[PDB]
From a paper:
Here we report the cryo-electron microscopy (cryo-EM) structure of SARS-CoV-2 Mpro C145S mutant containing the nsp4-nsp5 cleavage portion, at 3.5 Å resolution. In this structure, we glimpse the in-solution state of Mpro, bound to two unfolded nsp5 protomers during N-terminal processing. The final model showed all 306 residues from C145S Mpro visible for both chains, plus clear evidence of an at least 11 residues long peptide occupying both active sites. However, the cryo-EM structure of Mpro C145S revealed a dimeric particle of Mpro anchored to the nsp4-nsp5 region in the moment that precedes cleavage, with detailed density of P and P‘ key residues. The electric potential map around the active site Ser145* indicates a non-covalent interaction of the nsp4/nps5 peptide (residues SAVLQ of nsp4 and residues 1-6 of nsp5 Mpro, SGFRKM), forming an extended β-sheet maintained mostly by hydrogen bonds at Thr24, Gly143, Ser145*, His163, Glu166 and Gln189. In the cryo-EM model, we can see Gln0 occupying the S1 subsite, with its NE2 side chain moiety interacting with OE1 atom of residue Glu166 through a hydrogen bond (2.7 Å and 2.5 Å for chains A and B, respectively). Additionally, OG atom of Ser145* forms a hydrogen bond with main chain hydroxyl group of Gln0. The Gly143 main chain amide donates a hydrogen bond to P1’ carbonyl oxygen, stabilizing the oxyanion hole during catalysis. By carefully inspecting low pass filtered particles used for final reconstruction, we noticed an elongated satellite particle anchored around each one of the dimer active sites regions, with size and shape consistent with a partially folded monomer of Mpro. As expected, the analysis indicate that the highest conformational plasticity is concentrated in the active site region of Mpro, with the highest RMSD concentrated in the regions of helix 43-53, and in the β-hairpins 19-27, 62-65 and 166-171.
Residue numbers in the entry:
A (entry chain B), B (entry chain A): 1 to 306
C (entry chain C), D (entry chain D): -4 to 6
Write the structure that this text describes.
């Protein structure tokens, strides 16, 4: 049994990151084969933090200005290039620990295990959910840029994130390994605020599925409501609307637990209307919403490895 | 900023575990140097579940009956022995990835990152807190025995747990690598129930420190109460009593945030008496209590690596 | 009763 | 204001 914030193993990602330094500005970089993917903040002094000119700054920097350290190993930068909003530093050494990697741009709501790092030493790993406003509620400090988020399935790693900045409201922002940001953010110290945060409904449904399977079934009731009424109530309660695709992806959980999707949709609607009533579901008094159905399946009674 | 359930990196522990099999009963084991520490559940058929005779069972099993698999690598069992409630299988191959390991028996309330595993493949890693009733609220299923919990400091790993059983109330139990249980349990399918669960006060205070430093300071107030009154209120609210040592270990956080210990003790007492009043502290509507002050220091503004 | 775990491996 | 991050290493 048991159910809590469980993150993927990190060794395959622990052994594939280095420290990238330019002058007095350093950060973490994701090392794959003979390439190092790093945020382009590396070529930025403190005085030009407001409106960096990344083209001019990159065309000013040289090959030897980039310093790559894999623990205590020194790496030479054979070449450097920029794509979108990241830098690929072609290095002379191929990483022996690089696993089967994919660069996927995950849609909002899909969770992933970020590897919080500082100066090339993995500080830790924890789950995060890509919010609909295209931010992550991670725990990062100065020097944590380049802390990649990833998924692991069938012993294959898919990197889907690279941390870049904190928003003033406390949430964090990042790119994919291709370079494009997640959202309308810009790579400069300009006043940027994410949109209104909306709680993900499908993740809540997966969390309720996990609660039912674990042994907590007080919220279940015989009452059943249609999809459209549930969508209206979620909209007036600031939750993401539920589509047919979300019900379709919940099919394995419905088969595993034996409760139909609409039944727990009605139960969830009633939970919103009457509140949580003061009691507790699996150690949380608020609806946890960073649990995808795939994560529930691979973490609950299913015995999926990685 | 940011603050959530952050667990230690696992690669140094991912690369040091194998699968131990006897007949039709398999499970996970911790491989260190030329030794494999496994639960003695491995020598257990389904029929003798009530009162296993581990001495007779071990004296009946032979060396070749134990099968050790490191992924796709087959390991020969040179010898086997029992200590307390674990088996050390001396194998012919020394693990090249074994790090500096220590076997520490953590006191209740000290958190640790369990590496949930299934059939030798690391399924994931997540934080857990050793409850005062000497249980952990982990997420484990069948075949997860041997999933070691560990801490990492100064790139040195200290194993402090090994999962063995689930209690009927839903919490899990385990040993240390020395073999002694954490609590009054017995290693058999006998009806065993843990005592009344008590929330750890020092961990709550550390969580409040993290909330204050992160930027949430609504609960703070000028009211201040003595230690004895706070202890009485915690006792009548089913929390662990607070001693002088707990205030002493909280010193670094007091210096970092500038808030006196008794001030937040009074604030916490008032929170207990008046409830949480429906608002939220860092995504949780209940007092999180699996955050040690050391974990807060190494996770918050402190830039400690591993 | 305890649900003390180990894997149920075939063969 | 954005808190665009990197390391604050000296030398």
């Amino acid at each position: 049994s048991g159910f809590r914030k469980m993150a993927f193993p990190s060794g395959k990602v622990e052994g594939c990151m280095v420290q990238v330094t330019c002058g007095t500005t350093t950060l973490n970089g994701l090392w794959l084969d003979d390439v190092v993917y790093c945020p382009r903040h590396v070529i930025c002094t403190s005085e030009d933090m407001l409106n960096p000119n990344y083209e001019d700054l990159l065309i000013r920097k040289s090959n030897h200005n980039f310093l790559v350290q894999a623990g205590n190993v020194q790496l030479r930068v054979i070449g450097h290039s920029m794509q979108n909003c990241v830098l690929k530093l072609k290095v002379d050494t191929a990483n022996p620990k690089t696993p089967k990697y994919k660069f996927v741009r995950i849609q909002p709501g899909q969770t992933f295990s970020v590897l919080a790092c500082y100066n090339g030493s993995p500080s830790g790993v924890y789950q995060c959910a890509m919010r609909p406003n295209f931010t992550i509620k991670g725990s990062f400090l100065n020097g944590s840029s380049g802390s990649v988020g990833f998924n692991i399935d069938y012993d294959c790693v898919s990197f889907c994130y690279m941390h870049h900045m904190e928003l003033p409201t406390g949430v964090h922002a990042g790119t994919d390994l291709e370079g494009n940001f997640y959202g309308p953010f810009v790579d400069r110290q300009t006043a940027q605020a994410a949109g209104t945060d909306t709680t993900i409904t499908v993740n809540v449904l997966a969390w309720l599925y996990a609660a039912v399977i674990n042994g907590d079934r007080w919220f279940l009731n015989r009452f059943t409501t249609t999809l459209n009424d549930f969508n209206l109530v979620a909209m007036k309660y600031n939750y993401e609307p539920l589509t047919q695709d979300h019900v379709d992806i919940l099919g394995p959980l419905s088969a595993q637990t034996g409760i139909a999707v609409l039944d727990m949709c009605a139960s969830l609607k009633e939970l919103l209307q009457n509140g949580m009533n003061g009691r507790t579901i699996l150690g949380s008094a608020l609806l946890e919403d960073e649990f995808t159905p795939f994560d529930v399946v691979r973490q609950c009674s299913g015995v999926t490895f990685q």
